[PDB]
Subunit: 220 residues, 3 copies
């Protein structure tokens, strides 16, 4: 029965080829087995419930419920920090609740109102208004739409609009895509207009804390 | 090889003489009062219909100098801290005609250009604050505001403000100011490319029309 | 007599220059003197608030020249020059400037909004006319200031600022003024590219420094 035997060297090389193929195929399914922590419309449906309250208590109760629903995915009270944001000609403030390489969640708004450029991200951005007014002017048009508390503005990837927030506008924001590339835009005016390097450090530290949380949760 | 430099500078001098004579003997396609009156006739119409009528009338008054509908594109413009949108109808190295405005209003720096700019308001308001002064002026639909070369002002467009702009001077120099916030504030390279492509299309049209 | 090591005398000279530089910096701080008191400019400007801003500016300039001869720029060197920074735009007229102090009339006829800037200096703004909305870092509310009031901005603090139409104020700043001028020309370089405004601003600083140097060296 010499025709049933298999040499050892050919078997070793064939198993190397087999593991090569298996690894090159199961690496692909990592994009097919993608798992987002939050559903796409879950953040909006969650924030639309707290829009009736004042934005302070609304933020507090929303953070409580978001920690209850996704334990180990929201930054603790020790690392929650309002930091300024200057980009595209507008200025607001953010408080980062969750931050990964594919997702981010943050409270965002302005107490004075601000106008400017929305930016062109490799990400989809949802903004659910808790208070105030939002004015969006889409590219190519000559008109603008207004959004009120409870409503959600969706901003697809690659799109560019003109944005205007009235006085005392506050919203939650969810972002799915290449988050670092968006962080590149959200710090342009901070570098070339405001020179507020302390704010740069604060935003980068918030991102680092979010990533540390998302990694320590994956390991425990 | 010492005479090669002499021949090079000789050809260069003759070419510069040709260029100087051509720049001096060049006429202008449009007139300031022409654009002003055309934009003033339509100021009572809704800005969409006014834009359309003005484009058709400019096409029939100067054929071969207005871009076709396939090359007409609205492009955002972030400059001097303000953000509007423009649609280029005509653009050479000495003139340009465009439609400008904003649906949200915007404030910022007018720019320090090497050119004279004329804006006839179709709709909205235009607040101009001149350098060295402590008060501002306001222009309403139908009126024209002139920004002279070397002048810098503060500008404020109210919500839903649209105008027709006619600029005359060293047009390539305004590109530095018009795209500064695009590079350092918005990082919108796609809009930068759209702007450069509109300029290139205008130059292509003018060249082919001059050559027939 | 004995020798010292190549690393021994090195650290010894390091400690020597440390002692020298520290005690010299302390001697410098000890001899530091200020032309204007911490609240002098505000107290003086509040007296002229409420009038027409032109008349208030003229009377305040006359009063400052009377109270501090040799520290206020002459009429031929007074000039309104635009300022673009942190996304906002206004106009300034410098009356006094050194490496540690400065005084200027500031304001806008259109109103503006933007980043106040994070300085190594304490800056007070006394309002002659208009409105001043301030949004402090870490808060979701804003404070409005009317003519007669003074807004103090501490070193290291960063706020969002908004001036209503026809807002005019007097301002006194104390600290590392060059660091403030670094921010004061950000949009002028990366946004407006108005090099003539940059020249006007730097020439005003040079004139203030020249007046201060002449008065320090020759009195009067
Ligand atoms: C309408 C609201 C403005 N929309 C534009 C959508 C049309 C952007 C708002 C935003 C603020 C702030 C942002 O961050 C400064 C930011 O980008 C997130 C990048 C980041 C930040 C910290 C940690 C991790 C990742 C985006
Ligand atoms: C109403 C105030 C705005 N006024 C200031 C002076 C009245 C300028 C508005 C403008 C916008 C946008 C402009 O171009 C983006 C622009 O310059 C046009 C030159 C160009 C550049 C590239 C391609 C074709 C033409 C000018
Ligand atoms: C937001 C309110 C503006 N508050 C900031 C206080 C938080 C500063 C106002 C200022 C404007 C503009 C300034 O410079 C243009 C400037 O610095 C003055 C120093 C100088 C500058 C040029 C020449 C000589 C001296 C200061």
């Amino acid at each position: 029965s010499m025709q049933w035997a298999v040499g050892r060297r050919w078997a070793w090389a064939a198993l190397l080829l087999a593991v090569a193929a298996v690894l090159t195929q199961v690496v692909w399914l990592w994009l097919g087995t993608q798992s987002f922590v939050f559903q796409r419309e879950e953040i909006a449906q969650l924030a639309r419930q707290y829009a009736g309250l004042d934005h302070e208590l609304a933020f507090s109760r929303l953070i409580v419920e978001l920690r209850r629903l996704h334990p180990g995915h929201v930054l603790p009270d020790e690392e929650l920090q309002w930091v300024f944001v200057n980009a595209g000609g507008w200025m607001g403030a953010m408080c980062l609740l969750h931050a990964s390489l594919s997702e981010y969640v943050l409270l965002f708004g302005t107490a004075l109102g601000s106008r400017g450029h929305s930016g062109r991200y490799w990400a989809e951005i949802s903004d659910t208004i808790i208070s105030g007014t939002f004015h969006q002017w889409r590219e190519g048009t000559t008109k603008s739409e207004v959004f009120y508390p409870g409503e959600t503005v969706v901003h697809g990837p690659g799109e560019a609009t003109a944005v205007e927030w009235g006085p005392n506008t506050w919203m939650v924001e969810y972002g799915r895509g290449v988050i670092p590339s968006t962080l590149a835009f959200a710090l342009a005016d901070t570098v070339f207009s405001t020179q507020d390097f302390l704010t740069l450090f604060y935003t980068l530290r918030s991102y680092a804390r979010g990533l540390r949380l998302e990694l320590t949760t994956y390991l425990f």
